[PDB]
Structure formats: C-alpha cells, structure tokens
Amino acid sequence: STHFDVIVVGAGSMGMAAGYQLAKQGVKTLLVDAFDPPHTNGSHHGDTRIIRHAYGEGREYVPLALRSQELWYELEKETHHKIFTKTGVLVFGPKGESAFVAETMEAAKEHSLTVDLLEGDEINKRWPGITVPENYNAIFEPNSGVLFSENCIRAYRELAEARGAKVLTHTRVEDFDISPDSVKIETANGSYTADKLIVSMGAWNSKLLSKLNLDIPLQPYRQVVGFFESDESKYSNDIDFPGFMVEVPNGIYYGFPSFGGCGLKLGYHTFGQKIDPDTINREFGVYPEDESNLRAFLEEYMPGANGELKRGAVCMYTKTLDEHFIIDLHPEHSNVVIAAGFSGHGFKFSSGVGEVLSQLALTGKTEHDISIFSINRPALKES
Ligand SMILES: *Cc1cc2c(cc1C)nc1c(=O)[nH]c(=O)nc-1n2C[C@H](O)[C@H](O)[C@H](O)COP(=O)(O)OP(=O)(O)OC[C@H]1O[C@@H](n2cnc3c(N)ncnc32)[C@H](O)[C@@H]1O
Ligand SMILES: [Cl-]
Ligand SMILES: [Cl-]
C-alpha cells in the first residue's frame, strides 16, 4: 500500500486531467482506476467528443470552456497523439422554439464569441447534406470543434506518468476512510493513504458516494451512438462538414463529420435508459430505440448519411437534477474533492476541470469561479 500527496480515485476524463496537473507540479500522485484508461466501460470512449464555446446549457460555462480550449491546444503541442480538429460546431432548431439555440446565441453575444448566424435555406446551401425547414435558424461556431477523447486521456496519462505519477489499474476502490488530517482508500489490491483525495468515478459516483456519507441524487443513463455509412462528398471533415448539436421538436441530437471515412456519428442526447453501471448492457442494438431513434433524425435532416450502420457504441451519462456539474470540496472534509454528475456534456471541460481539481486539492480553493457547480446548491438536493 503506500502514502502519497494526493490520491485520485477514478482516472478517467476528469481524474487523468487532474493527475497531469498535479504531476506537472512535482506533487506525488497516485491514480487508481477499476480498468485501464482509456477504456470502454466508462463515459469517455467512442473516439470523439464535441467542444463548444457558445454554450446553450448556460452562458456561465463559457469561461471554463475557453480555458479548456486553450489547455487542449497546449496538450496538442505536448504529445504525439492527435487532440483536436477545428470542425466548427453548428447549432440549429425551429426559430423561436429552441431554448438551447437561444442561450447559445445569447452566450455568444455576452462573451463576444465569433459566430455566424444563418436561417432556413442558407443552412442547406452552405452545407450540402443538411436539410432543414425554412423556419429553422442556426448559429455556427467556426473555432470550436472535435476532441479525440481517448487520445486526450492516453496523452494526459503518458505525461503524468513521465512526471512520476503512479497509475494503479484494474483496481476497484471499495471503501473510503477519511480522517481530519489524511485520507485512505481500500481495494482488493491493498490500502493507500494520502493528504488529499480527488473522487472522480463517473457513473460509479452514483453508487459509491454514499461511502463518503454523501447522499446526492445522481442517475446514470445508457446513451448510444451510431456511425453510419455516409456520402463522403458531403459529410467528410475534409469538405468541412461540421460537428453539431441541434434541438428539434422531439429532442436534442449531436453528431460528428466523417473522419477518414469512419462515417457520420450521431447520438440522441435527451433520451436514454436509466441504468446501473455494474449491470448496464453495453451491446448496441438490444433496444429497438438504439438504431431507430438515430435513423429517424437522419432520414429527416441529413438523408445522405442514413446508410449502413458501420459501428455502434454504448456509453454512460451521469445526470444531476439540474444537469449542472458537481465540482467542490466535500461538505465535511476539506481534504476531499468531488467531481461528479457531468450530465452528458462534460468532456470538453475535462482539461479545465483537471486544473480546478488540482487547485482545490492542493489549496482548498481555485482561481476559477465554480459556484454554479457547488455541492451545497439547492437544485442539487444534496444531503
Ligand atoms: C457517454 C457519452 C458521453 C458524452 C458524449 C457521448 C457519449 C455517448 N459526447 C460528449 C460530447 O460530445 N462533448 C462533451 O463535452 N461531453 C460528451 N459526453 C460526456 C463526457 O464524455 C462525460 O461527461 C465524461 O466522460 C465524464 O468524465 P468522468 O471522468 O466523470 O467519467 P469517466 O471518464 O468514465 O471516468 C471515471 C473513471 O473512474 C473509474 N472508476 C469507477 N469506479 C471506480 C472505483 N470504484 N475504483 C476506481 N476507479 C473507478 C472508471 O473506470 C472510469 O475510468
Ligand atoms: Cl461517443
Ligand atoms: Cl456524464
């Protein structure tokens, strides 16, 4: 077993980023993961992830989004792994009927973000492959884009390990023992202690936070994505087809241009199966909704991308009641940091969250404004 300065439980999107930030500073860190990140059992696989700046979930996310983007460019320069591609991100929906589109526009105004505003046929004309009604409007963000999530984690890990961070893989943490001046974790592979603890177990936060005497409503969701054979002359990243997140009458959908002919990737954001991370069925197609919900969108808005299903993936969201993250110190233990409930839209922020967690762990404070992610906020229902 062993003592460390800081122990990160759950070395995924947020945990690995935090580990890199801590290692960068010579802090002796131990990262423990139930698997070997990047892997396919958590919430970070599927190759790609969208990063937006003009934020429809709330203009208050923009600062963290912009910091995260600069950190993603810094990472790109530090590793041989591909990190980011500037595909741009298109957001559209029925004019005057999408709160999501409206807040994106408002967020762009408020932070002076570079965006293109277009409507109806202008959308169809600019991007062959997209067919929306004339009453639809859109906001395009040219400088945001796509992150290669597994590469990001792969890179952060290599860099952190090179700096002395230790990563104990295939080791599930089973319990916590917190004291006024130190922390302790129990695993089948042994116990470990440290001065500070960062808890970032993803979907498992919903099951294991009780071990830290925390009772926070968190619901894991089974969320699938599909890769479809597409008309490359319209949907390839090479011809500038963008990443997208749109709101139509029956929900919100997000997708990616085809990269090297992998096909257009699509996901249905507002619907998923309520599940438990330990019993979830990770095979794509076991629910008729998996493929049908995707094709229903494609046949209507992007017909040339409604070809054979090339690959399907199953992944998880961990939602809070207000769908805002939880990044804060444990209410009763200043030496414990919690990172949870990223509600299906937290990867783009993982670089910035890594920095935030590092600062909270080492100082109990952060230069970032994270009040909207407070663990004590009412809309969370925390006890
Ligand atoms: C699922 C999903 C999510 C998603 C997305 C598409 C899909 C299908 N597209 C996104 C996008 O385009 N843009 C964006 O910003 N986010 C998007 N997301 C959401 C994002 O992927 C998630 O918010 C993010 O991955 C959350 O990160 P977090 O770090 O919370 O989760 P993780 O990466 O799964 O890491 C948790 C790790 O902890 C380990 N673990 C679990 N239990 C234990 C125990 N007991 N002991 C030790 N380790 C444990 C896991 O193994 C995992 O590695
Ligand atoms: Cl995915
Ligand atoms: Cl999530």
Q: What is the 3-state secondary structure (H, E, C) of 139-197?
A: EEECCCEEECHHHHHHHHHHHHHHCCCEEECCCCEEEEEEECCEEEEEECCEEEEEEEE
Range of the domain at 155: 1-59+149-212+326-383
Mention every residue, 6+ apart, whose C-beta is less than 8 A from residue 223: 267, 268, 269, 272, 314, 315, 316, 317, 344
The 10 Å Cβ neighbour count of residue 331 is 16
Does residue 173 have its Cβ closer than 6 Å to ligand 1? yes
Task: Note the Cα 116 to chain centre separation in Å.
Answer: 25
* Domain containing residue 283: CATH number: 3.30.9.10
Instruction: Show which of 321, 338, 370 is a domain's final residue.
Output: 321
Q: Are residues 133 and 236 in the same domain?
A: yes
Q: Are residues 96 and 225 in the same domain?
A: yes
Q: What is the resolution of this structure in A?
A: 1.9
Nearest CA, atom 17, ligand 1:
345
Q: Are residues 206 and 73 in the same domain?
A: no
Is residue 248 within 8 Å of residue 294, measured between CB atoms? no
Name the maximum alpha-carbon separation found in the chain: 64
From the CA of 336, how far away is ligand 2's center (Å)?
30
Nearest CA, atom 35, ligand 1:
12
Q: Are residues 134 and 272 in the same domain?
A: yes
Q: Are residues 240 and 228 in the same domain?
A: yes
End-to-end CA distance of the chain: 32
Q: Are residues 166 and 314 in the same domain?
A: no
- Which residue ranges make up the annotated binding site for FAD? 5-35
Task: Note the Cα 272 to chain centre separation in Å.
Answer: 16
Is residue 55 within 8 Å of residue 107, measured between CB atoms? yes
From the CA of 107, how far away is ligand 2's center (Å)?
25
Nearest to 235 by CA among 174, 172, 310, 180: 310
Q: Which atom of ligand 1 is nearest to the CA of 10?
A: 38
Q: Are residues 137 and 189 in the same domain?
A: no
Proximal ligand: closest to the CA of 340: 1
Please indicate the experimental technique that yielded this structure: X-ray
